[PDB]
Amino acid sequence: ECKDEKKITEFLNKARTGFLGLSTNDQPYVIPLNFVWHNHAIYFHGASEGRKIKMIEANPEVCFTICEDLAYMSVIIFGTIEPVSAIEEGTEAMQQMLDKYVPSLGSRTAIYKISCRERTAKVNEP
Amino acid sequence: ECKDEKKITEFLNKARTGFLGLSTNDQPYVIPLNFVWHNHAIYFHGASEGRKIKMIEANPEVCFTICEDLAYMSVIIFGTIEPVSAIEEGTEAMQQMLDKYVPSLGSRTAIYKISCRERTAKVNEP
Ligand SMILES: Cc1cc2nc3c(=O)[nH]c(=O)nc-3n(C[C@H](O)[C@H](O)[C@H](O)COP(=O)(O)OP(=O)(O)OC[C@H]3O[C@@H](n4cnc5c(N)ncnc54)[C@H](O)[C@@H]3O)c2cc1C
Ligand SMILES: Cc1cc2nc3c(=O)[nH]c(=O)nc-3n(C[C@H](O)[C@H](O)[C@H](O)COP(=O)(O)OP(=O)(O)OC[C@H]3O[C@@H](n4cnc5c(N)ncnc54)[C@H](O)[C@@H]3O)c2cc1C
Ligand code: NA
Ligand code: NA
Numbered sequence: 001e002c003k004d005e006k007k008i009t010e011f012l013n014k015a016r017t018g019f020l021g022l023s024t025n026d027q028p029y030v031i032p033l034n035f036v037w038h039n040h041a042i043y044f045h046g047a048s049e050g051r052k053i054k055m056i057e058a059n060p061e062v063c064f065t066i067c068e069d070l071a072y073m074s075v076i077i078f079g080t081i082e083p084v085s086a087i088e089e090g091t092e093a094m095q096q097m098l099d100k101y102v103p104s105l106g107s108r109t110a111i112y113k114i115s116c117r118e119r120t121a122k123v124n125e126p
Numbered sequence: 127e128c129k130d131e132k133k134i135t136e137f138l139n140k141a142r143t144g145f146l147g148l149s150t151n152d153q154p155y156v157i158p159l160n161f162v163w164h165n166h167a168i169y170f171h172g173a174s175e176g177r178k179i180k181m182i183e184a185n186p187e188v189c190f191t192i193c194e195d196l197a198y199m200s201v202i203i204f205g206t207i208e209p210v211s212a213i214e215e216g217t218e219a220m221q222q223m224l225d226k227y228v229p230s231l232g233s234r235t236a237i238y239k240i241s242c243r244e245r246t247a248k249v250n251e252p
Contacts, residue, residue, distance in 0.1 A: 017193065019145045019147075019156050019191060019193075020156075021145075021147040021149075021154035021155065021156035021189075022154055023147075023149035023152055023153070023154045024152070026149055026150070026185040026187050027149070027187055027189075028147035028148055028149045028154055028187065028188055028189040029147065029189055029202075030145050030146075030147035030156055030189045030190075030191040030202065031191065031200075031202070032191065032193040032198075032200050034252070059152040061152050061153055061154065062154055063147075063153075063154040063155055063156045064156075065145060065156040065157065065158065067143065067145075067158040072158075074157075074158050076155075076156065076157070101252065104251065125230065126160070126227065
């Protein structure tokens with residue numbers, strides 16, 4: 001039931017893959033995504049078309065769950081998602097990603113931002 | 127947009143962690159779980175108390191997403207979840223898990239079963 005803000009941040013900076021949970025009606029949908037943790041927020045680059053985007057336009061309340069090694073730590077982030085229009089925020093977040101992953105989603109894409117309303121972390125046995 | 131039933135099965139047998147997506151109202155909740163793929167279904171052992179179980183009793187329509195290495199493969203499973211009362215199905219599934227993970231959730235637990243109504247797989251670049 002962890003609460004060490006530096007450990008979590010380190011984890012959120014290193015973790016490669018996160019799982020975005022959406023729902024319209026009572027029908028959940030969970031997809032893996034590359035992401036960066038920046039500001040007090042999760043950003044990812046994504047095609048601005050698809051099931052994920054229909055659901056978001058319908059219901060921007062989302063969940064983002066990350067879980068990995070360095071016993072297992074898992075973080076869950078609740079908040080609301082929205083596409084980024086701020087050019088510089090958008091550009092920072094993109095550079096932050098290349099730096100993270102590299103130190104076609106093709107036609108029409110955008111940067112998306114989940115504002116961290118609530119966050120919970122846990123360390124787990126097996 | 128893969129469709130090789132043997133490759134997927136091999137993947138579902140080996141993958142360590144899955145992500146269970148639930149919703150009540152328009153509020154998603156995603157948690158990581160140990161699991162086995164058996165029958166045409168996902169089973170896991172879990173405490174029969176907690177947020178996960180309140181939501182399930184309210185809305186048994188769920189999503190289960192698995193994503194890992196052996197380029198990246200990701201599988202999404204849609205279906206309905208329910209606790210297992212069948213003693214032998216329950217016992218097979220439990221043995222299947224020990225064999226998978228080992229070849230406190232404490233008080234009150236159960237085996238849960240997501241019946242695979244629909245399944246989709248994908249292989250991904252980065
Ligand atoms: C490790 C990894 C990293 C990824 N990183 C990113 C990224 O940063 N940005 C990004 O946009 N995408 C990323 N993806 C793919 C991401 O899941 C896509 O956005 C998603 O696959 C397509 O989204 P959609 O809802 O618009 O798809 P749609 O094409 O509209 O999906 C419709 C149907 O296709 C199936 N489906 C969709 N996605 C998947 C999936 N991933 N696996 C199995 N079935 C699926 C579902 O059954 C769904 O109902 C990554 C995937 C992996 C595995
Ligand atoms: C890799 C790994 C494997 C796991 N395998 C299993 C397993 O097979 N069976 C099992 O029951 N559990 C497993 N867990 C833990 C699983 O997530 C628990 O069921 C869950 O953590 C508690 O479920 P709940 O909704 O009843 O929790 P509750 O205690 O009722 O949760 C209430 C609040 O706690 C927070 N929270 C709950 N779970 C997590 C979490 N995992 N990470 C961060 N915050 C959380 C959320 O903010 C939530 O709103 C595993 C976890 C990890 C990381
Ligand atoms: Na993972
Ligand atoms: Na994973």
